[PDB]
Amino acid sequence: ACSDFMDWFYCDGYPCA
Amino acid sequence: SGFLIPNAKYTTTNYFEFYLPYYWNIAPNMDATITPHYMHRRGNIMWENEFRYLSQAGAGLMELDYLPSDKVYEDEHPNDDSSRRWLFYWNHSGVMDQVWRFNVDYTKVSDPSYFNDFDNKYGSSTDGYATQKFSVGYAVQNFNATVSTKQFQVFSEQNTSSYSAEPQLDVNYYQNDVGPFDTRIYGQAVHFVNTRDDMPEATRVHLEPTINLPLSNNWGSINTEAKFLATHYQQTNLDWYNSRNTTKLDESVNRVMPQFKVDGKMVFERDMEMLAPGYTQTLEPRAQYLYVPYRDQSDIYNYDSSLLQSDYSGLFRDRTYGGLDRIASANQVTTGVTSRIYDDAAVERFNISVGQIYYFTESRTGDDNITWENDDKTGSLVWAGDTYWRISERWGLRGGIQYDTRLDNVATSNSSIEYRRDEDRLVQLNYHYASPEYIQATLPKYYSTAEQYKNGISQVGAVASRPIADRWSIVGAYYYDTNANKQADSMLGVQYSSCCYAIRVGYERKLNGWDNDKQHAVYDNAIGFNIELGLGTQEMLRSNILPYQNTL
Amino acid sequence: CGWHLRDTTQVPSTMKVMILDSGDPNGPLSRAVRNQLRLNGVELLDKETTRKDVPSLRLGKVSIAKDTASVFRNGQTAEYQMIMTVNATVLIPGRDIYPISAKVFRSFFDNPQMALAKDNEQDMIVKEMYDRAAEQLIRKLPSIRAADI
Ligand SMILES: CCCCCCCCCCCCO[C@@H]1O[C@H](CO)[C@@H](O[C@H]2O[C@H](CO)[C@@H](O)[C@H](O)[C@H]2O)[C@H](O)[C@H]1O
Ligand SMILES: CCCCCCCCCCCCO[C@@H]1O[C@H](CO)[C@@H](O[C@H]2O[C@H](CO)[C@@H](O)[C@H](O)[C@H]2O)[C@H](O)[C@H]1O
Ligand SMILES: CCCCCCCCCCCCO[C@@H]1O[C@H](CO)[C@@H](O[C@H]2O[C@H](CO)[C@@H](O)[C@H](O)[C@H]2O)[C@H](O)[C@H]1O
Ligand SMILES: *CC(=O)N1CN(C(=O)C*)CN(C(=O)C*)C1
């Protein structure tokens, strides 16, 4: 998926949660 | 120059706290800060004074805290004359004219329990003593002479006897290109006094001429060194120690002794084909033979000599004690290997080191009173290892391990992996270990029997940061002792940052001393907010008793 | 085994004659860097010499921080973590400016009962750390030459 898997803990954008 | 924004705090040691700072802009290079600090549980106002200065001699900071009376202190100490508390701090550092070096690091407190009750801004509750150091040095390209004074205020009531070198003179002279050799001379003159009036007092004069032959090459290097140590001890006030100790100190002692060292290093390179092409692997063998003859030293009191840790860098050190009171004999060979990985841009991506020390004969001093688990004396005894992997630009992983067969167990071990996108965005895990056997071997005798030191160290720490919308920053830290299965330190911080103001709210729970009546730790809570006129993540991460350190 | 002895110099050939520049030329870090450059055959020129077609190495800020790595069961410090950070710059003349850094970690246990002795140990640790900050700086010289191409 993403190059950085740590985006799921902090990415903002749309949280989609 | 005017009033700042009053911040507030609630702690279990002081209850409600209030600060009312006032900033005085004296000059462009000088300023001061006067802060009345109301404490409700102690029921008074402590006056805090900052004074920052910049001058020709360097930059300096002075702090003076004074509390005229203390209800809590007088309740705990009803028989004392007065309950005043105070702190004096002075930190000066400067180099004038590129040759004069001025250093001052002075801390003095009224009582040993000052930092357990008060704000840890220029001290900490984790500190076991206060340092009082003055230093004036003259340094040029081939010579330096430093006069320094060292004193310590020990907080522990078990034993406050601490030695201090009131004068201390250090003189280094260097002379390169004396034919094929490089020469150096080191001189020292020190005077050791003690707070107690019955302990031995001493004066020491040390001289150390060394000459080395280095031979370098594209793939290897060999360095030979011959050193000479000449020490004169003149110690008086020995009636007490000679009266109650079987071994007798002598008033005059002359210790003259050579040292021979031979260090060698090699570099091998290969191209990493199985991994991604363009990466180069370097294998670096290193060896060191060290010979130091044995001289009996039971007649010299140990003033400033302590055991040194043996990491991988410390395996190749030529000294096993600090200072000059204890100089163990050595007939040793040290062997180590370091492997390094390089990417296509010639950037070090990985390195691993392992080494050991083989003793051909027992290392003696004449005062060998170290508690060893077994009776190992010769052979391959000390092992060390380090690793540092830069997994990517945002990941990093350091680790280190120390093994001593005389302890019959791993002595110390540390590891940590950190993710750091940037200063506002990071996560770190770390682990620190120190076996009970090593605590027994290296620390004081009462450490091995005290409940709060005997078990050693087994600590796991986690730190995290999380910014929200480029206006909020949440930082957290949690440290856990696995031997006791209990918390050591926890921290939370939330800072809302705006164009003109920033509001910070913090929380910490920390180990804050021991209770001998029930034999358990005492914890402290603190919730405070301050307003100021970056997101402040790094400042929040430095606010606990186990501050965050960058690891990449 | 595919290994072979390192046929290339530790310091690049273009950086064999170079200028050492710093704001504290008599400091311990400058002495350590000059010493390590002297082992590697580097010819150090004065900063005021007329020979301008040589790379320059400008030492920058040096920071040493001592903190509490771990604490005992009563909150007292057990391990002291000393961290040294050094920032330096390499000026390739007429080409570019390349920042470099060196960060060194060391640790030691505290002992108030022999605090003076521990203080001496701390000084010795600092005297090693500068050397560890010297070898790291020259070790990043090949990266600058690689980056220059
Ligand atoms: C908590 C205990 C466990 C701790 C360990 C957790 C895992 C630690 C390893 C995580 C790093 C590897 O995971 C991933 O690897 C890839 C593969 O190169 C690298 O990922 C990289 O990909 C490319 C470069 O190749 C870059 O564009 C990207 O930005 C970068 O992330 C990083 O290294 C990391 O994103
Ligand atoms: C880890 C295991 C131990 C590894 C250690 C291995 C030993 C060290 C290997 C490096 C040897 C350095 O040896 C290197 O030899 C060359 C060639 O003789 C010397 O070269 C120089 O001196 C020689 C005389 O000796 C003359 O010919 C001339 O002046 C010049 O060539 C270098 O001054 C020296 O640096
Ligand atoms: C060769 C290069 C090495 C690079 C670094 C590799 C090691 C990196 C750090 C390793 C960290 C783990 O550290 C490890 O912690 C465990 C957990 O208690 C210690 O273990 C110790 O206590 C446990 C239980 O408490 C006992 O069962 C065990 O016998 C004892 O050794 C190990 O002695 C130590 O080695
Ligand atoms: C890195 C990645 O794959 N994503 C996917 N997203 C969701 O699953 C919601 C979008 N996203 C963020 O919002 C940070 C990142």
Residue numbers in the entry:
A (entry chain C): 1 to 17
B (entry chain A): 226 to 758, 766 to 784
C (entry chain B): 999 to 1147
What did the original publication write about this model?
LPS biogenesis systems are essential in most Gram-negative bacteria, with LptDE responsible for the delivery of LPS to the outer leaflet of the OM. The outer-membrane associated β-barrel is made up of 26 antiparallel β-strands (β1−β26). These β-strands are connected by turns on the periplasmic side and extended loops on the extracellular face that fold over the lumen of the barrel and require rearrangement to allow LPS molecules to reach the external surface. LptE is tightly bound in the LptD β-barrel.
Binding modes were described by cryo-EM, resulting in 8 high-resolution models of SfLptDE in complex with Bicycle molecules at 4 different binding sites. The binding site of Compound 13 on SfLptD (near the periplasmic side of β-sheets 20–22) contains residue Arg691 (highlighted in red in Figure C). The corresponding residue in E. coli LptD is a tryptophan, and it is therefore considered unlikely that this molecule would be able to bind to E. coli LptDE, due to the hydrogen bonding stabilization between the hydroxyl group of Asp12 on Compound 13 and the guanidinium group of Arg691 on SfLptD. R691 is highlighted in red in (C) as this is the site of one of the 3 sequence variants between E. coli LptD and SfLptD. All Bicycle molecules had a protein binding face and a detergent binding face, with protein contacts being stabilized mostly via hydrophobic interactions. Charged residues on the Bicycle molecules were typically found facing away from the protein. Overall, the backbone of SfLptDE showed little rearrangement upon Bicycle molecule binding compared to the apo conformation.
